[PDB]
Amino acid sequence: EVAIGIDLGTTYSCVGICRNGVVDIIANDQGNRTTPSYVAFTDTERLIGDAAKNQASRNPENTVFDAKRLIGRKFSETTVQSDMKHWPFTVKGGSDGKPMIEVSYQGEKKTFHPEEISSMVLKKMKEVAETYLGKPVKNAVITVPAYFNDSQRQATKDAGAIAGLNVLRIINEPTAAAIAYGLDKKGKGEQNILIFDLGGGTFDVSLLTLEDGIFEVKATSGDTHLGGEDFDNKLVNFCVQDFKKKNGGKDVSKNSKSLRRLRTQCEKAKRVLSSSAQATIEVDSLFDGIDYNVNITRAKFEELCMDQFRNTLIPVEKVLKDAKMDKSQVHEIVLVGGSTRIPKIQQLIKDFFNGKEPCKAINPDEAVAYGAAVQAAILSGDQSSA
Numbered sequence: 469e470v471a472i473g474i475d476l477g478t479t480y481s482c483v484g485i486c487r488n489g490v491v492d493i494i495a496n497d498q499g500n501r502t503t504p505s506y507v508a509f510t511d512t513e514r515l516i517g518d519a520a521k522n523q524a525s526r527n528p529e530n531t532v533f534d535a536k537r538l539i540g541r542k543f544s545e546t547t548v549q550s551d552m553k554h555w556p557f558t559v560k561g562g563s564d565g566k567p568m569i570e571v572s573y574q575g576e577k578k579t580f581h582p583e584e585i586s587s588m589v590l591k592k593m594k595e596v597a598e599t600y601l602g603k604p605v606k607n608a609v610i611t612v613p614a615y616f617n618d619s620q621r622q623a624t625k626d627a628g629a630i631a632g633l634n635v636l637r638i639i640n641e642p643t644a645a646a647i648a649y650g651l652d653k654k655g656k657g658e659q660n661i662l663i664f665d666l667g668g669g670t671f672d673v674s675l676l677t678l679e680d681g682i683f684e685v686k687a688t689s690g691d692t693h694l695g696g697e698d699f700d701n702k703l704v705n706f707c708v709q710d711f712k713k714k715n716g717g718k719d720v721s722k723n724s725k726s727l728r729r730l731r732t733q734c735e736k737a738k739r740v741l742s743s744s745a746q747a748t749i750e751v752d753s754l755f756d757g758i759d760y761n762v763n764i765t766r767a768k769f770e771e772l773c774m775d776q777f778r779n780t781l782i783p784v785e786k787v788l789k790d791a792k793m794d795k796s797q798v799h800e801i802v803l804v805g806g807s808t809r810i811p812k813i814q815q816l817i818k819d820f821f822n823g824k825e826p827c828k829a830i831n832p833d834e835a836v837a838y839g840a841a842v843q844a845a846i847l848s849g850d851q852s853s854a
């Protein structure tokens with residue numbers, strides 16, 4: 469009977485439930501409404517979510533993330549060759565051509581397929597919902613990017629089955645975000661919807677059309693390597709150079725642990741800058757026992773990221789061109805992904821659409837799970853959201 473909606477994200481995952489026409493996004497054990505898509509293996513335990521992300525800098529080799537970049541892919545694919553430079557964990561090709569993620573767990577070498585790693589994240593989201601409901605959950609709707617091919621969709625479904633979920637349906641992330649805002653119901657005539665999704669690792673722009681409760685993905689574009697982690701890297705690179713000028717040319721980038729600790733504080737300051745004009749980046753005993761401290765204004769962060777922020781409009785122009793439509797024909801602009809909280813990004817999109825206010829009432833990192841939860845309730849026979 470009970471069906472949940474799960475956004476299985478590249479960096480963060482989110483679970484929601486739609487009951488009595490309303491959607492609850494469920495907080496995990498730490499009170500977090502989203503959970504890192506991380507799995508770590510130690511000498512004693514298997515950690516998932518917050519606990520896995522929290523010890524990533526201390527156990528880089530055995531902390532797995534980005535399994536969504538590998539799911540349903542052949543190891544020989546050029547995207548795997550390119551992405552693997554970003555991973556401290558080992559990935560090798562099996563005899564069937566499938567990627568095998570290699571870690572040490574309890575002093576033993578273990579290998580996992582990407583869908584096994586994703587099944588552990590899905591199982592954690594299932595348990596987050598179960599703790600909240602006080603009852604077992606079997607049914608789920610899971611979302612995937614619109615560009616996911618048959619192999620990536622099937623492997624995501626398999627990850628659900630391994631997690632103990634009966635996958636009612638795999639639906640597109642941009643469509644789930646549009647469903648969250650009731651744009652399928654409120655719009656009787658044709659509606660052109662632009663989904664602007666900027667997360668932690670990827671940027672997806674999708675142009676949808678909705679005529680008579682039916683959504684069609686007309687055009688998609690974006691950048692699979694543009695997200696919040698790239699804005700954090702702009703702050704990291706600046707701090708590395710700032711440390712050099714302060715401490716006689718000493719180079720923090722030569723120590724990978726120093727970089728990881730600096731990156732963690734850079735991402736925190738970045739979040740603060742979405743609601744304050746300034747933030748402090750502080751790392752005690754960063755490199756060579758030297759303490760590091762710097763103040764970053766929102767203007768300086770905007771300057772370091774200026775080109776990356778402005779270039780988010782290029783895939784917007786591309787989808788409009790592919791769909792053969794003018795920006796004036798877009799009825800709604802939906803902001804999805806945690807990076808859409810950046811004020812400069814919101815301003816750039818608004819100005820591009822000639823002052824049109826984007827739909828951002830739903831927490832942008834929750835809108836996909838929210839829509840998946842609505843769809844899961846509908847597929848279970850509950851018409852209360854409609």
Ligand SMILES: Nc1ncnc2c1ncn2[C@@H]1O[C@H](COP(=O)(O)OP(N)(=O)O)[C@@H](O)[C@H]1O
Pocket residue numbers: 476477478479480481502666667668669670695696697735738739740742804805806807808809810832833
């Ligand atoms: N307040 C905030 N301002 C700027 N960036 C923010 C933010 N809150 C979250 N983020 C960013 O959102 C990214 C994760 O977005 P999310 O939509 O949850 O993840 P995902 N798996 O879909 O990529 C991270 O880079 C994080 O720093």
Ligand SMILES: [Cl-]
Pocket residue numbers: 469470471472486487844845848850
């Ligand atoms: Cl339900």
Ligand SMILES: [Cl-]
Pocket residue numbers: 600601
């Ligand atoms: Cl409840």
